[PDB]
Design a protein around this ligand. Structure first.
Ligand SMILES: *[C@@H]1O[C@H](CO[C@@H]2O[C@@H](C)[C@@H](O)[C@@H](O)[C@@H]2O)[C@@H](O[C@@H]2O[C@H](CO)[C@@H](O[C@@H]3O[C@H](CO)[C@@H](O)[C@H](O[C@H]4O[C@H](CO)[C@@H](O)[C@H](O)[C@@H]4O)[C@@H]3O)[C@H](O)[C@H]2NC(C)=O)[C@H](O)[C@H]1NC(C)=O
Ligand code: HEM
Ligand SMILES: N[C@H](c1ccccc1)c1ccccc1Cn1c(=S)[nH]c(=O)c2[nH]ccc21
Ligand SMILES: *[C@@H]1O[C@H](CO)[C@@H](O)[C@H](O)[C@H]1NC(C)=O
Ligand SMILES: *[C@@H]1O[C@H](CO)[C@@H](O)[C@H](O)[C@H]1NC(C)=O
Ligand SMILES: OC[C@H]1O[C@@H](O)[C@@H](O)[C@@H](O)[C@@H]1O
Ligand SMILES: [Ca+2]
Ligand SMILES: [Cl-]
Ligand SMILES: [Cl-]
Ligand SMILES: [Cl-]
Ligand SMILES: [Cl-]
Lengths: 464, 104
């Protein structure tokens, strides 16, 4: 058991502790780590590869599931309305919550022993990892059900299957629209956006849409954006007393907080009205994830940045220079050359002290170290890895929302009006939301508008 | 695969008609570069004591975190041009794309 022992035997690869560690004084101790499952267990022929349990497609599989048994169980089969099942014990001011899951070892039950609130059941197993995440999962559960209701009013003959499929199709297209129109340009910046994501032409069945092993580690660049608190705000966007800034180490798998501390409205307002943390070369990641990750459900606090580096080794990922070469970027060899690439000689020196060669720098470490692209939140290397992946997921998707035959021209025109602040307006008791772009806007009342100024999705073109 | 369809399958199977498991769930990741393991095929770097990576000692992930990632929280810089929703969409989006299973 990798959670309870420090023995380095299958399937464990514990993180060894350095001398004079600022937290772990006993070098005989470790950080828990289970190696990712191999694609071919016990093989003496294969080069170890890892599995992706999910559909690589931007198809909202985190809502619907990636396996048929789970997808069936996430649906309400008690009628023909084509709805997703909702919580049968609790509601958020009369609004739907995700149903609870039945976990053998339920970590949510450990976050507050007395509340006895288990983990939520969604399309992906991590929905409860943080209440802010649970809130986004809850929002989409409600959007599906809201679409299915409006689709039933428009097409009364349509059965349960048809209503579920048509609402699922709209939700997937909304996740694709918010990702590529609003999210990805602010990740990459305009230069890398133009280079790696050029204007969509059409579906190309020769574009491999699989997630690359490197992407599972590169996309963890987002851990540098994590604030050390969960921020909850009331209907005036003011700190919601008595717990406005709850430390992140006290919110992991804390599903009891959504259920017993005010639902998803204070959480969504906190996400909209609080700035992200900015990644800086001497301010990479907070101790809330570096020292206290999963503090309430593990024998010790985990170190997310260190887990990322161990994970890249577990996965046999090549080092920084090999990924620089893959991306056609110069490969620094000297501490001076690294100093120039990073525009930071002090950091290049620390990286060289740690690794000895830039060839060995772990992909996440090297990737997050790079200065950020103009109007972007990643350096050249992460922009190449992220941009390449998202271009493949778009060009290799037969069900891409702009692919000919997926939607009609009138439906595409209707879908181009959607936005995340509008989904928040339609599925919560929140009446004031961020101005577009929601991912940029962060100051209340300055970047805020009332829901009444935003047009709803027109379903007129879905009438059969 | 059925010659004609209207919606995606749940597993992602049949999205690519020529190679119908591409992008489908419970399938191996694609490798953009060949793997680099201590023994060449399975053991990770840092596994065996004394075994160096490309001429240098393997740096403990925890030591890299302490020396490079660690910073005083009082110095945190809020992003003037990004909301915390920007971080949150990133995790939710990641959770539509990949989950690397581990034994429980
Ligand atoms: C449909 O999509 C496939 C795959 O696209 C690839 O991935 C995408 C995500 C994106 O990055 C694309 O830009 C990328 O191509 C396309 O098929 C690929 O097409 C290129 C160009 O034809 C192929 O590259 C070739 O590889 C040869 C290896 O045998 C090599 O000989 C070629 O180079 C030589 O010849 C050219 C021309 O004379 C010369 O300029 C070179 O300098 C060199 O001498 C060339 O590099 C890819 O291998 C193809 N990939 C696959 C998987 O088949 C396809 O074209 C695209 N179709 C449309 C209509 O968009
Ligand atoms: C509250 C925010 C976040 C977390 C808590 C969190 C935690 C993790 C953990 C523990 C892992 C696995 C660690 C390991 O390798 O052993 C993890 C993996 C991944 N994340 Fe994390 N994450 C939080 C938030 C984000 C954000 C904002 C991300 C991107 C913008 C992000 C990405 C990822 C990805 C892609 C992975 C790998 C997932 C996989 O299993 O394939 N995370 N995160
Ligand atoms: N074993 C994890 C645990 C966490 C706390 C207590 C007990 C056990 C775990 C449980 C449920 C879902 C996911 C995970 C790990 N996990 C998380 S939280 N996030 C990722 O992105 C991820 N990828 C692979 C794995 C994983
Ligand atoms: C299914 O839908 C009905 C009608 O909205 C609702 O009352 C019921 O609780 C739902 N069942 C589940 C399991 O979600
Ligand atoms: C645990 O949950 C209960 C509600 O059931 C709450 O009153 C209590 O304050 C919680 N514990 C802590 C330490 O917050
Ligand atoms: O496959 C990932 C990348 O590999 C290399 C080039 O062929 C790129 O065009 C491609 O995007
Ligand atoms: Ca998916
Ligand atoms: Cl329930
Ligand atoms: Cl997670
Ligand atoms: Cl409000
Ligand atoms: Cl790879």
């Amino acid at each position: 058991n990798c959670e309870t022992s420090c023995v380095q035997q299958p399937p464990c690869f514990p993180l060894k502790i350095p001398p004079n560690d600022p937290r772990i004084k006993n070098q005989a101790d470790c950080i828990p780590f289970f190696r990712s499952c191999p694609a071919c267990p016990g093989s003496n022929i294969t080069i170890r590869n890892q599995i992706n349990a999910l559909t690589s497609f931007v198809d909202a599989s985190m809502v619907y599931g990636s396996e048929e048994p789970l997808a069936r169980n996430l649906r309400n089969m008690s009628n023909q309305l084509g709805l997703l099942a909702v919580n049968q014990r609790f509601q958020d001011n009369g609004r739907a919550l995700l149903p609870f899951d039945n976990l053998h070892d339920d970590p949510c039950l450990l976050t507050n022993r007395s509340a006895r609130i288990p983990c939520f059941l969604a399309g992906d197993t991590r929905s409860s990892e943080m209440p802010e995440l649970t809130s986004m999962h809850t929002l989409l559960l409600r959007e599906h059900n809201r679409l299915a209701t409006e689709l039933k009013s428009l097409n009364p003959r349509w059965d349960g299957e048809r209503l579920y499929q048509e609402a699922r199709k709209i939700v997937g297209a909304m996740v694709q629209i918010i990702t590529y129109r609003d999210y990805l340009p602010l990740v990459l910046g305009p230069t890398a956006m133009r280079k790696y994501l050029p204007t969509y032409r059409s579906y190309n069945d020769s574009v491999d849409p699989r997630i690359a092993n490197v992407f599972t580690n590169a996309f963890r660049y987002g851990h540098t954006l994590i604030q050390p608190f969960m921020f909850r705000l009331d209907n005036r966007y003011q700190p919601m007393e008595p717990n406005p800034r709850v430390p992140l180490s006290r919110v992991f798998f804390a599903s009891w907080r959504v259920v017993l501390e005010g639902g998803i409205d204070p959480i969504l307002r906190g996400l909209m009205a609080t700035p992200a943390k900015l990644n800086r070369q001497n301010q990479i990641a907070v101790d809330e994830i570096r020292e206290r990750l999963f503090e309430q459900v593990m024998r010790i606090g985990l170190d997310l940045p260190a887990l990322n580096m161990q994970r890249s080794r577990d996965h046999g990922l090549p080092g920084y220079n090999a990924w620089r070469r893959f991306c056609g970027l110069p490969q620094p060899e000297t501490v001076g050359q690294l100093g120039t690439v990073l525009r930071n000689l002090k950091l290049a020196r620390k990286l060289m002290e740690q690794y000895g060669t830039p060839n060995n720098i772990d992909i996440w470490m090297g990737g997050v170290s790079e200065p950020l692209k103009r109007k972007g939140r990643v350096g050249p290397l992460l922009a190449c890895i992220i941009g390449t992946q998202f271009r493949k997921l778009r060009d290799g998707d037969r069900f891409w929302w702009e692919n000919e035959g997926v939607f009609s021209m009138q439906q595409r025109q209707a879908l181009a009006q959607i936005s995340l602040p509008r989904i928040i307006c339609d599925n919560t008791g929140i009446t004031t939301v961020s101005k577009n772009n929601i991912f940029m806007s962060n100051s209340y009342p300055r970047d805020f508008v009332n829901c009444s100024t935003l047009p709803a999705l027109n379903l007129a073109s879905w009438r059969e | 695969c059925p010659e004609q369809d209207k919606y995606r399958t749940i597993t992602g199977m049949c999205n690519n008609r020529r190679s119908p498991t591409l992008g489908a769930s419970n399938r191996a990741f694609v490798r953009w570069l060949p793997a680099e393991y201590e023994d060449g095929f399975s053991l990770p770097y840092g596994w065996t004591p004394g075994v160096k990576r490309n001429g240098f000692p393997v740096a403990l992930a925890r030591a890299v975190s302490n020396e490079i990632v660690r910073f005083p929280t009082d110095q945190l810089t809020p992003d003037q041009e990004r909301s915390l929703m920007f971080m949150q969409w990133g995790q939710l989006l990641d959770h539509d794309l990949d989950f690397t299973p581990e034994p429980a």
